[PDB]
Design a protein around this ligand. Structure first.
Ligand SMILES: O=C(O)CCC(=O)C(=O)O
Ligand SMILES: O=C(O)CCC(=O)C(=O)O
Ligand SMILES: [Mn+2]
Ligand SMILES: [Mn+2]
Lengths: 9, 425, 422, 8
């Protein structure tokens, strides 16, 4: 659960 | 005249962090501490302001955007991130309502899929870093805070595009973290850095750096883009990647790692010394093997990178990226490798072992980092030294290739040429 | 010859009788095939009760789906031609594809419905410490269901109905970790050729190339293939252990967390510096391993305990959900229960030890932040070891600073039906 | 793809 979404799952 | 130098990946990064020297950056800042670059360049400020605007949301929504996948809306309440996302398609009026009335922060994902300049910038960075480079845009209305203090799992370069924002950076509780997490202010201590970002400013910090920001009261909202990279790109990841290759690629000669563990081993309440010494033996043997030969191992990391990165930036259509141009190479031609930073060489887990060449020239820009069939060229391992020649040479004569026959020399170059990887000079 | 269900060991011992376990593991296990031919009419009768063609009649009435529960196939030209329909499988349709089209039927994980196969496989999971699945193969007379090939698991084949002609070949990939079909021309001549009849048991290691066919006649062939040890090699355990070491690294230790050199993935040759750095990490890890023993996280342990069968229960799983007998007091002596269904590990203001068990696992989903367990302070580890290794131990003898946490530790384990007051 | 479906 990251706040910044580097790579969308 | 041009804000950033797009001549090469290196020139782009050099201009991106100017005046800071790249040598100083990697020696003193990268993965060590934050780097704040406050400027007062009118031209740069205007260029940054063109990377992404709050007003672009209207046009973006007409293209079909979804909550969660493309955009999130949130506000910081009681040190926790409150989500104001709706279901399905996101409409511009919904975003504006939560933004203007609920004082919510808007977070747009992977804008490089639609914004051309961010595509050009991020593609160059992927080449320079050799790692995936995504980005998120954060738009926060005046007098508010969208997210509570926290840290992320990636290296970030933050560009302030519109308005100003008040930032506070804290020492990491988990240095170079490979996981993200919210943090309670009552456990992060005093800020190591506190400042104001304005259009044209750039901020870098390593994964694990705790941070929080809020837009000052007034009529101006804040807009910034966070360009991130180096997710799961540590020595630990690479070490597991290599060991996996060394253990699941070896031929049928040494069955020792293929034999089964003792029965009920997983039911033991202690790490059996029998397995302990045995595992240590394998590790030492593997270490010797790694130094024993300059082998070429399979790498899931290489494959993950090449298949998900951005394709080369194209002003018009992808002509020179899919359709070979100029003149066909011959045994008497002088060839030069093209799109070198968009190619990887590896081996898969045929009589002789083969070497595979993969490139991202045909990768989709529209699905970059969205986590939504991938063929490459094949050559016998004997061609490796020839490939190194083409790689480590500005221009090379086809006849000079370290191959036994001329047909191999021509064939090799022809194969690479068909993928637009060769330029006949 | 009758299977003895008194313990995991007794079960396996009887299963392979008259072959001794000492012999099995010293000469056959993961080495070469083992054919056990018997002349035990009772055993042959027992085997027949494990599974038969007509059982699908009741099974399909329950509702069985193609692909998921059943698969219809037939070997044509060295390949498997599938005759599966999309949806629910009706016994009449299967019978049609079987008797008319000469197709072989393959039922997946019969233990989900057959209590005997459940009772057997569950004891085998305890004995091996690995997941144990099974597939039923029903082939009509004078036909063949599959082309020559090899699998990635250790198998125990039990001939249930009729006879079947088996041919085993030398493995192309010894103790393979992947399955693969082979060309009839690349396998050579059969190393073993024989006929399996009801009551017979056949074992062969992963990698063993094989192919079978039901002889001409009226009677069909029915056998169950009980498999285990999938991805349970030292290589797997090595990666499992290293992952644990790498990712369970302390907050103050950052070397393995630092980034690799930029563009390293774009290189056409392993740099000598990266190779040296890697060799250095490996040797360090090696030393760290033999150095101070300690519990490390293990995805293999978690995968096993989360997907294995729950203890066999004649009727309702009452004994598995609600504890029985008297509550353990500080003066009583206790004995751990369902020991082979318990695993102790660690997670990726003191450190904690976690205990997981499979007493509440679903039999219906076998092999087809949602799994919690019991948490305990690392300070209780030595006490947990005492209980685990003891046949019967008094609560007072537990190595804990206070008597309260001794009654607390036992009570906690008792509520989960893991402790019985001896 | 395995012919024997050990684990679905
Ligand atoms: O602007 C904010 O509220 C936080 C932005 C942030 O967390 C980031 O850029 O990683
Ligand atoms: O009997 C057959 O068709 C093949 C059975 C098989 O391959 C197995 O039991 O692993
Ligand atoms: Mn952040
Ligand atoms: Mn098979």
């Amino acid at each position: 659960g990251c706040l910044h979404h580097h790579r969308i799952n | 005249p041009s804000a950033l130098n797009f001549d090469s990946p290196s020139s782009l990064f050099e201009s991106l962090i100017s005046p800071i020297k790249t040598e100083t950056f990697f020696k003193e800042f990268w993965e060590q501490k934050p780097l704040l670059i406050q400027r007062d360049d009118p031209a740069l400020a205007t260029y940054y302001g063109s990377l992404f605007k709050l007003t672009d949301l209207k046009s973006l929504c007409s293209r079909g955007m979804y909550y969660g996948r493309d955009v999130n809306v949130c506000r910081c309440v009681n040190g926790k991130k409150k989500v104001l996302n709706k279901d399905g398609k996101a409409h511009f009026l919904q975003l504006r309502k939560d933004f203007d009335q609920k004082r919510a922060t808007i977070q747009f994902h992977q804008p490089q899929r639609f914004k051309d300049e961010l595509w050009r910038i991020q593609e160059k960075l992927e080449c320079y870093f050799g790692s995936l480079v995504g980005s998120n845009v954060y738009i926060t209305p005046a007098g508010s805070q969208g997210l509570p203090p926290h840290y992320d799992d990636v290296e970030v370069f933050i560009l302030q595009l519109e308005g100003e924002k008040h930032w506070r950076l804290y020492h990491p509780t988990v240095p170079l973290a490979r996981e993200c997490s919210v943090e309670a202010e009552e456990r992060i201590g005093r800020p190591v850095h506190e400042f104001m970002l304005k259009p044209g400013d750039l901020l870098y910090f390593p994964r694990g750096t705790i941070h929080q920001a809020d837009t000052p009261a007034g009529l101006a909202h804040s807009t910034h883009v966070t360009i991130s990279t180096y997710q799961n790109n540590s020595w630990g990841d690479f070490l597991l990647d290599t060991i996996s290759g060394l253990v699941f690629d070896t031929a049928k000669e040494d069955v020792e790692l293929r034999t089964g563990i003792p029965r009920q081993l997983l039911l033991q309440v202690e790490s059996t010394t029998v397995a302990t010494r045995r595992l240590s033996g394998f590790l030492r043997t593997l270490a010797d093997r790694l130094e024993g030969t300059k082998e070429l191992l399979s790498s899931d990391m290489k494959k993950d990178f090449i298949m998900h990165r951005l394709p080369p930036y194209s002003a018009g259509d992808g002509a020179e990226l899919s359709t070979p141009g100029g003149k066909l190479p011959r045994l008497d031609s002088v060839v030069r490798l093209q799109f070198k930073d968009h190619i990887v060489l590896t081996v898969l887990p045929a009589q002789e072992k083969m070497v595979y060449i993969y490139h991202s020239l045909k990768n989709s820009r529209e699905t970059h980092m969205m986590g939504n069939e991938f063929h490459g060229l094949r050559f016998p391992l004997s061609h490796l030294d020839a490939l190194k020649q083409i790689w480590n040479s500005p221009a090379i004569s086809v006849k000079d290739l370290k191959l036994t026959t001329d047909e191999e020399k021509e064939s090799l170059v022809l194969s690479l040429w068909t993928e637009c990887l060769i330029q006949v000079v």
